[PDB]
Homo-oligomer: 115 residues x 4
């Protein structure tokens, strides 16, 4: 599991459950090619997006579908989605966790890059 | 104005208005002495807590009364308050802005320290 | 000034100075059209991106060039940029402040939306 | 495990390893009584602080020793420590996670309260 996403909800104080997450890779022509997607679990986590063989160096975009998340809870949100854009570099550690903390008018994101 | 506090509300997307703030300073006996207090304005800013003369070197605690803020909006939040504890002025007088971003179960704070 | 951007540096405890910002607007063909750009001042603020007349209703992307900021300070950061994507002015004209707090492997953003 | 603490480092993009964490309970006389303590693991987590029997309703303070953490990495920090103060309420969920994201001049904290 070289890429994991974990999402928390700062309003309810809970994992962000059943959030859609789409991952894209940047292609030669500067367009975003679908790469992986899924919905966060009851623990706010999304595992099994990719394999070591498929996850090569390059620029990736993780789009978190926050607007749908907030509307399903009856909450008025600001953002269309949260976007996390980063380069995967085989220099330094092998396992990427993208963590995000959601509020209706804010979000925070960090990277936990290990082993 | 060497100590200021700015607070934003991450649910409404707005300044956090009427947030009470209490500042304490660690005394010679290692207790927290009340130093200054105030509330955020319509802009989410709190000016005039202290003076350059009174804001001497020490360890300060800025307590932002987040529970009282959320309860006044009819929300039951997680935290009692947000605490920001730091040593001030140890390399000479500085101007400190303590900024905070509030949600019911979460907050962020940062410090902006400038040399006038 | 209906769209402003403020950026702080969580490592230095200081405004984030000379941060490039590019704003895009989604066009009729669903592509991102360049809308406006600028850089943060010595205060970490970017004023004068747009006008009330030009800042019409639409979906906007504010791209904060965090990688370029960190690399200019000699640091190799994680993210390419921070993106803030939102619908603006759908209930009439508003004033938007996009605030961001940067670290090498992390950022926070918030929006402050006011009705003049 | 009714109380867990998990700490991340926003400068290195890693768990915050070997951070000292002290938990206090507020006593009748408004003083802070030591309750539990430990050091975060290689995953940035601190498990086994308390038991269901010991963790009663009341006001708790979690002090994270950030200043020592940053100085051991050779980084100049702002805060003396990070402090998270909250009421434990048997109304609503049973398991508390205090999560924190550390920078030299900032920190973020959230609560994940589940089951
Ligand atoms: O003029 C502005 O926009 C200032 C500013 C700049 C950045 C922030 C900010 C603070 C936190 Cl704790 C988190 C975030 Cl995302 C922005 C903030 F609360 C306030 C100094 C108040
Ligand atoms: O495995 C994960 O995703 C966990 C996690 C998820 C998110 C955070 C976190 C906390 C804050 Cl205050 C801010 C951000 Cl972006 C992430 C965190 F500290 C820890 C639970 C450990």
């Amino acid at each position: 599991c070289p890429l994991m996403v974990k999402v928390l909800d700062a309003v309810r104080g809970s994992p962000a459950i059943n959030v859609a997450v789409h991952v894209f890779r940047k292609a030669a022509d500067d367009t975003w090619e679908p790469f992986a997607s899924g919905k966060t679990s009851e623990s706010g986590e999304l595992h099994g997006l990719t394999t070591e063989e498929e996850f090569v160096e390059g620029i990736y975009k993780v789009e978190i579908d926050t607007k749908s998340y907030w509307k399903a809870l009856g909450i008025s949100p600001f953002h269309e989605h949260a976007e996390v854009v980063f380069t995967a570099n085989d220099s330094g550690p092998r396992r990427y966790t993208i963590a995000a903390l959601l509020s209706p008018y804010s979000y925070s994101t960090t990277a936990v890059v290990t082993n």
